Structure 1
């Protein structure tokens, strides 16, 4: 009935779109007898300016002690020439690690009202609805050893290590099987098991877990083939599970295929703590304060918060329905504007979503 939510407004358009999502979350939850206590905490450039680091401990503490975390965006010109460990992005890596949210869920859907935004033909883009479950805190991005060394003659050698232990594969796979159960019951595990030992172990562990989720249809696909299949017939996918680097690449491809980056939400889940919910778009510093931002991705991230974070299915559906009503009514922010629709600002789009909720 009452949940604790940490808000991380962050940078650029972050505070603006989180403020709207906060209100939508309140109203939708209210209609299901659910109430929230919100606390805003610093992260990213906002934290750098206020505290001097991208992620203060107080923010980690508040996040960990809450039921779920809703983040806006991170990044800005001001901090782009900071040392690496003091860049806003570092705070995002750090809070994922601290919350142990190893599972990144990014749903790529093409909404009926926005089909023509995709560069894919209508009959190919219409009905696309897939979920990339990406291992988020491990693999080659974090693997050791790594470096640039000067070998025995004058010459530099640069190296990185793709590495996963069995338990890291198991836990991301389990989340993917559970996620397929909340969707259409089809899971495609994507790897390079024809050449990489790390992928051979990936496929071995996923294959072994299949018997524990016998209700889910499991298939396997190579990464380069998945990159082709997303272009040729993306409607074939329900849920995809893959490692960090392949998930990064394939999800971004899928996101672009839908055609509307400003619409796309994300969830980052752990085994037993609060999840982290965030739009995948950036901080869009050039339109900050100009009332142009698309709040719908953050609103849909609050819907994922309710569904995947708190198990509040009905409240989440209320949010998703109201977004569809706003789009059905012809309202579009600039990034999704098309002839014959109603171009609106961030605030007005937020207002239109709120009325369908409260209708």
Structure 2
């Protein structure tokens, strides 16, 4: 056996995806390549303090390190070892550092069935920002991570498969396509749409969020994006009636918006409104391609994209990770910024229901940034001495001990 499960631990469980967490949950973690070992072990240190300072031994994460990537290769000769997979299907929750793409990330998502990609982007107190007023950006994107025309159903223009489709459409649908065309089949799932809409509303109800906007270009693509918006509304009302209110209803004769507001906006002006009035958005729900575009812009609203964390949640499991590469160039030098992976840890806490410790990490970070206790990649523009990876983590801990 490679691993030795913590006998004082207990698997996190799921009921209708409610995610029920024990006082001593076993959580997996993969160091990752490059800077991973450093930012991740630093993350695990700040989270434990955030847990003990908020619950004081009444709760404690029993970490279990599994191997994947170059560590697994340089030790067991398998970049993704069977024992590692068995621990993943059993414990179902991993905080994983960055891993090169020499696939492991896809493998994990597939085997745990993580369909929803979550990207929370809120401004942190004293960071540089391309915006003049970023101090209002507090949104979280919910992306259905295997649904748009990312499924892969496409063919080169000079392929016979493409010829088959062109012949088909021409006589079976009376649709005429030229020969010099590349063809892709965009597919929009009803089930997939409903599954992610549930997660979005659920999350809003658990963390008492107020607005849930649907990003869509359903005015032009009626049966894919348009269908998405329709279904989203359908299941939101057929299943969470007592919790939400359509924008069309408060803007009507049955107001009282003291609960979740489900509304929608065409995707065209979306890119405008996030750059000029980011406060207009809270929780954004959209298909796979939109979410890939909207989120990158989102994170641009507030510089230091590598200080954000994300997640991949499924009906029963989750994977959390910083949103940056392995930076093999700064590996083992105690220079890298561990904020990105610590922020994934925070998100992992929120999902866990442990909002008190999540909130501590957030406050600790905000404090340190405005107090100039930062790693070199930020202090460069904050003209002050840079703190190392371990030191930055310790400053957070040292701060956390004095709320």
> Which category of TM-score, normalised to the shorter sequence, fits these structures?
0.7 to 0.9
| Pairing 1:48-127 to 2, within 5 Å after superposition | 48-50=73-75, 54-66=79-91, 68-75=93-100, 87-88=101-102, 90-114=103-127, 117-121=128-132, 123=133, 125-127=134-136
CA shift digits 1:268-292 (9 cap, x unpaired): 2112x22111111111122112211
Cα distance change on mapping 1:203 and 1:303 into 2, 3 Å? same
Segments of structure 1 that go 5 or more residues without pairing to the other structure are: 76-86
Distance (Å, rounded) in 2 between the aligned partners of 1:279 and 1:13: 12
Answer with 275-284 or 335-344: which moved more: 335-344
Deviation at 1:37, TM superposition (A): 2.1
Distance (Å, rounded) in 2 between the aligned partners of 1:44 and 1:178: 34
- Residue 36 of structure 1 is matched in structure 2 by 61
Question: SS at 1:356's partner residue?
Answer: helix
1:134 to 140, 143, 146: 143
2:232 to 186, 189, 206: 206
Q: Is the 8 A contact 1:111 1:127 kept in 2?
A: no
Distance (Å, rounded) in 2 between the aligned partners of 1:285 and 1:147: 36
Deviation at 1:29, TM superposition (A): 1.8
CA shift digits 1:181-203 (9 cap, x unpaired): 32531011112212222112101
Q: Is the 8 A contact 1:4 1:37 kept in 2?
A: yes
- Residue 323 of structure 1 is matched in structure 2 by 365
Segments of structure 2 that go 5 or more residues without pairing to the other structure are: 1-22, 164-178, 245-258
Distance (Å, rounded) in 2 between the aligned partners of 1:46 and 1:229: 44
2:49 is the alignment partner of 1:27: yes
Greater helix proportion:
1
Q: Is the 8 A contact 1:101 1:137 kept in 2?
A: no
Question: SS at 1:112's partner residue?
Answer: coil
Deviation at 1:106, TM superposition (A): 0.9
Deviation at 1:340, TM superposition (A): 4.8
Q: Is the 8 A contact 2:24 2:62 kept in 1?
A: yes
Number of matched pairs: 340
Answer with 286-295 or 338-347: which moved more: 338-347
Cα distance change on mapping 1:50 and 1:150 into 2, 3 Å? farther
Question: SS at 2:200's partner residue?
Answer: helix
Cα distance change on mapping 1:189 and 1:56 into 2, 3 Å? farther
2:32 is the alignment partner of 1:4: no
| Pairing 1:147-226 to 2, within 5 Å after superposition | 147-148=155-156, 150-151=158-159, 157-181=181-205, 182-196=207-221, 197-211=223-237, 212=240, 213-214=243-244, 215-226=259-270
CA shift digits 1:313-345 (9 cap, x unpaired): 212222222222322332121222233544211
TM-score between both structures, scaled by the size of structure 2: 0.78
Q: Is the 8 A contact 1:96 1:137 kept in 2?
A: no
- Residue 290 of structure 1 is matched in structure 2 by 333
Cα RMSD for the two superposed structures:
2.2
Cα distance change on mapping 1:53 and 1:223 into 2, 3 Å? farther
Distance (Å, rounded) in 1 between the aligned partners of 2:94 and 2:358: 15
Moved over 6 A (4+): none
Answer with 132-141 or 339-348: which moved more: 339-348
- Residue 83 of structure 1 is matched in structure 2 by none
Deviation at 1:180, TM superposition (A): 2.7
Cα distance change on mapping 1:288 and 1:204 into 2, 3 Å? same
Q: Is the 8 A contact 2:39 2:341 kept in 1?
A: yes
Q: Is the 8 A contact 1:10 1:43 kept in 2?
A: yes
Question: SS at 2:390's partner residue?
Answer: helix
Deviation at 1:298, TM superposition (A): 1.1
